[PDB]
Amino acid sequence: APKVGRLIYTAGGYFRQSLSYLEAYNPSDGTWLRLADLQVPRSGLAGCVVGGLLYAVGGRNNSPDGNTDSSALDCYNPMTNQWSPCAPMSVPRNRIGVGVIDGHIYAVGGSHGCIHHNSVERYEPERDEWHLVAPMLTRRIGVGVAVLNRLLYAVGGFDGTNRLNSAECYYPERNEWRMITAMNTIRSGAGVCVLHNCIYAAGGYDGQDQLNSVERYDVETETWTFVAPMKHRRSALGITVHQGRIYVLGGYDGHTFLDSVECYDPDTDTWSEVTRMTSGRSGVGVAVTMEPC
Ligand SMILES: Cc1ccc([C@@H](NC(=O)[C@@H](F)c2ccc3c(c2)CCCC3)[C@@H](C)C(=O)O)cc1
C-alpha cells in the first residue's frame, strides 16, 4: 500500500476571505510546494483522490463581493499542474464532506444558504456524471466523512439547530443509511479519517468551544474511545492519513487561524508538531496523491 513520492495536498481555505491556494507538503523532507491556484476561491470544501487525480468538491466563495455556495467539482492533475472543471453537483454544498468508494466520489450534506442538506450524491469519473443516492437520516453541515471497508461514514456536524454527536453509516449495496453509536463528544467541523479499523474524529466545535480531544470508533466493537488529545484545539481543520499516521492541518480555535500541523502516531498514542503551513487558514480540503512533475 505505501509508495514513495506521495504528498499531502491542501486546497482552498479561509482567512479574511476564501482562498485559492493549492500547496503540497512532503513529509520526507519537510518542504512545501506552491502549485496552481484554484480557478475559484473556496472554503468549506472537501478534497479527495481518484486514480491519482485530486478533486476539490463544493465549498463557498466568501469574497468582498459576496458569498456564493459552490456546486463545483474540479480536478487537479499533478502530471500537468492544471485544474480542469468537471460536471457540477445537483446542489451547492458548503461545509461538505466527501468519501471515495470503488472509484466513485460521494458528496455528503453541507449547506446552501439557510438550507441544511441531508441529501447525498455520487460522482462517476469515467462518465463525468453525478447521481443522487439515499439521503442521510440527519441533516449535517460541517460533517466529517470517511470510508472504511467500502462503507461510508458521516460523523457529527450541525443540523441548523444543534451541533451533533450522532453518526451514521451508508451501505451501498442497500442504498441505505443507518445510525451508528453516537460519539462521546458533540463535534461540528471535526477532522474525520480512517486509520486501521477505526474512524477517528479529531477536534471540532461543540457549540461553545473548539476541541482538542480526539476519539475513534472501532467498527467491530461499535464503541467510541478517546485517544491522546491534540496539542492545539481546532475546528474546521484539514485531515488526512499518510504512512500510518494522522495529519491535522490548520483550523480555527476561536482566537487564531492556525498554521499548525500535528501528526498522530497510533503505536505510541502521541501527537507531534511536524511543520507549519505557509499561513494560517481554516476550512481546507486535504488529500494525498503522487508528487507533481
Ligand atoms: C468548514 C467548517 C465546518 C464546520 C463549521 C462549524 N463551526 C465551527 O466548527 C466553528 F468552530 C468555526 C469554524 C471556523 C470559523 C469560525 C467558527 C468563525 C470564524 C470563521 C472560521 C459550523 C457548522 C457550526 O457548527 O456552526 C465551520 C466551518
Side-chain angles (χ1 to χ4, degrees):
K3 58 180 59 180
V4 303
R6 296 180 67 86
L7 310 184
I8 297 174
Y9 287 78
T10 177
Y14 181 84
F15 178 74
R16 304 182 189 270
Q17 66 189 208
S18 296
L19 309 169
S20 302
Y21 307 149
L22 179 63
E23 294 171 323
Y25 177 69
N26 191 337
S28 296
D29 62 10
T31 65
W32 283 92
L33 292 180
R34 179 69 182 277
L35 300 176
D37 283 2
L38 289 157
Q39 291 180 3
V40 180
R42 53 216 293 190
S43 52
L45 74 161
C48 67
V49 170
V50 181
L53 298 177
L54 173 68
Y55 291 88
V57 196
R60 163 179 271 204
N61 183 10
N62 289 305
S63 72
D65 293 358
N67 290 11
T68 304
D69 293 313
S70 176
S71 64
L73 176 67
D74 298 284
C75 184
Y76 174 81
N77 190 344
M79 301 295 100
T80 63
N81 191 37
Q82 293 178 355
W83 288 95
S84 297
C86 300
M89 297 179 293
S90 67
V91 65
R93 300 180 183 273
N94 183 32
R95 302 175 172 175
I96 193 184
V98 306
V100 175
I101 302 180
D102 197 9
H104 306 111
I105 304 176
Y106 287 79
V108 179
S111 61
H112 174 205
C114 63
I115 299 302
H116 303 82
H117 300 319
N118 66 324
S119 65
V120 181
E121 49 191 303
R122 189 191 74 161
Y123 178 73
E124 302 157 355
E126 305 292 339
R127 287 158 287 187
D128 191 30
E129 294 178 359
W130 288 94
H131 296 294
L132 268 292
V133 296
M136 290 182 296
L137 305 177
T138 312
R139 293 170 171 159
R140 303 181 184 271
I141 82 176
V143 58
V145 173
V147 174
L148 177 52
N149 190 32
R150 285 179 60 173
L151 298 176
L152 183 79
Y153 294 84
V155 177
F158 180 55
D159 67 9
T161 305
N162 295 119
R163 284 82 188 180
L164 307 168
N165 70 321
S166 69
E168 49 189 296
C169 182
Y170 176 74
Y171 301 86
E173 58 264 55
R174 302 288 176 84
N175 191 34
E176 176 180 335
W177 289 89
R178 303 179 184 178
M179 305 303 305
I180 62 166
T181 309
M183 293 185 291
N184 305 305
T185 306
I186 292 175
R187 300 179 190 273
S188 184
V192 171
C193 67
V194 164
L195 181 52
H196 307 149
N197 211 40
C198 292
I199 316 280
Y200 284 73
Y205 179 62
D206 65 4
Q208 297 183 358
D209 302 312
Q210 289 78 23
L211 308 167
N212 55 23
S213 67
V214 181
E215 55 187 305
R216 69 187 180 196
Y217 174 79
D218 188 315
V219 302
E220 172 187 343
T221 66
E222 304 172 0
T223 66
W224 287 93
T225 302
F226 285 102
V227 307
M230 299 174 297
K231 268 62 181 61
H232 308 291
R233 63 182 62 258
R234 56 183 82 213
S235 191
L237 56 145
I239 192 167
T240 192
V241 175
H242 174 66
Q243 302 199 343
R245 295 169 187 258
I246 300 176
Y247 289 79
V248 298
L249 296 85
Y252 181 67
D253 63 0
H255 179 67
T256 312
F257 290 86
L258 299 181
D259 58 7
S260 162
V261 180
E262 301 187 56
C263 182
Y264 178 72
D265 182 3
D267 289 4
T268 60
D269 190 26
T270 56
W271 289 89
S272 301
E273 181 75 16
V274 287
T275 184
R276 296 186 181 274
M277 310 182 68
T278 60
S279 58
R281 67 196 74 156
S282 64
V284 303
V286 182
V288 176
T289 189
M290 287 296 302
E291 56 191 356
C293 299

